[PDB]
Design a protein around this ligand. Structure first.
Ligand SMILES: N[C@@H](CCC(=O)N[C@@H](CS)C(=O)NCC(=O)O)C(=O)O
Ligand SMILES: N[C@@H](CCC(=O)N[C@@H](CS)C(=O)NCC(=O)O)C(=O)O
Lengths: 209, 209
């Protein structure tokens, strides 16, 4: 520590880690970069891969949302109890990112004539996560263990942004519906979810959702 | 162990993992799925996310080329020396993953038209890996630290695969070039890159490169 997130005023990718850092009682500092600020062309050239978020934790400066999500998982110990769980979780996040990536192209590239297509295909993508749950205490626990992990925050987020995009999507997946109901009811998360910092934040930075 | 890979008959997202198994003196089984067996509709319904590679280590059945590299990375212990390194390691890999994704889509979706652009913006995407090296021990060690990691096998593949798509691309990046020479000279590596098993294997499915 201390924790500082650097990124455009949007939930985008950072909302997951914000939820993790909050669930785990940590306090971080937000450092907004508006598109206007970004266009100045001074900060971007410092960014390792020319993008954001840029996360700092003490003398350690990271990049890549997932690299960050995993570092938080190793540090706050939300990355499993054995090399086996670490695999299951990683197999889950890698899947989440895969889907989210599509969600990004849809919203920032072909939203108008793309949404109908993606909304129909969506179901096939959520089924695995439902299956994963069926195969663990009957979806009464978490995505991988009996404990929360970096992967759980990420999945909870993706499902939350998909409740905006394709309303009712999880109706046919009774476990994922439970999953979201519980995780969101977690005291610290519910606190965050009603937070003005989060409620006054555009899911994506172009006005489409 | 034992190690068993289930993939199509191409390098693609599996060459770097096979390549790590070689360096670590390990032996694995390659159950090769020809396209026909895939189109017949045999495995797909069983596979977590449809797609392959599928991997089995003992009784652990993994999925996702990156959840695998990380697994082999933790098991064989080549995931850095401490946390700061592990995180720095992920940021390098996820970086690799991105440039790789762009590779794929140009290949299976636009080789003809797009190759013209890919090659010209490529340098902007190689820079960071030239940067990371210069910072880390004058670029005389690996991408992160002085101990080889899973991240190095992915980045080596990516670089090799890019020399074919556009010779001399690494000519303006001394360090990265040398990183390829050094990592290629490694006893098991050289052998693997010399082995017909690897050679006769086509880089991508649609024989484009
Ligand atoms: N693989 C990176 C990609 C992050 C990303 O998409 N960054 C975008 C914002 S959502 C960005 O920085 N855009 C600014 C730019 O490219 O100029 C990650 O997942 O962290
Ligand atoms: N997200 C997976 C992607 C796996 C993948 O894209 N596999 C390709 C071959 S390179 C495939 O053909 N999958 C079968 C299909 O599309 O049905 C990973 O990280 O490795």
């Amino acid at each position: 520590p201390p924790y500082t997130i650097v990124y455009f005023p949007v939930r985008g990718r950072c909302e997951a880690m914000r939820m993790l850092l909050a669930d785990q009682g940590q306090s971080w500092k937000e450092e907004v970069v508006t598109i206007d600020t970004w266009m100045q062309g001074l900060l971007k050239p410092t960014c390792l891969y020319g993008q954001l978020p840029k996360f700092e934790d003490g003398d350690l400066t990271l990049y890549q949302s997932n690299a960050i999500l995993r570092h938080l998982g190793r540090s706050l110990g939300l990355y499993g109890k054995n090399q086996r769980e670490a695999a299951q979780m990683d197999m889950v996040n890698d899947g989440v990112e895969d889907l989210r990536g599509k969600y990004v192209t849809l919203i920032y590239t072909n939203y108008e004539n793309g949404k109908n297509d993606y909304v129909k295909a969506l179901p096939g993508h959520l089924k695995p996560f439902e299956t994963l749950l069926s195969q663990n205490q009957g979806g009464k626990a978490f995505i991988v263990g009996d404990q929360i992990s970096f992967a759980d925050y990420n999945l909870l987020d993706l499902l939350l942004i998909h409740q905006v995009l394709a309303p009712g999507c999880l109706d046919n997946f009774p476990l994922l519906s439970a999953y979201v109901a519980r995780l969101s009811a977690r005291p610290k998360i519910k606190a965050f979810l009603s937070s003005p910092e989060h409620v006054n934040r555009p899911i994506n930075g172009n006005g489409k959702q």
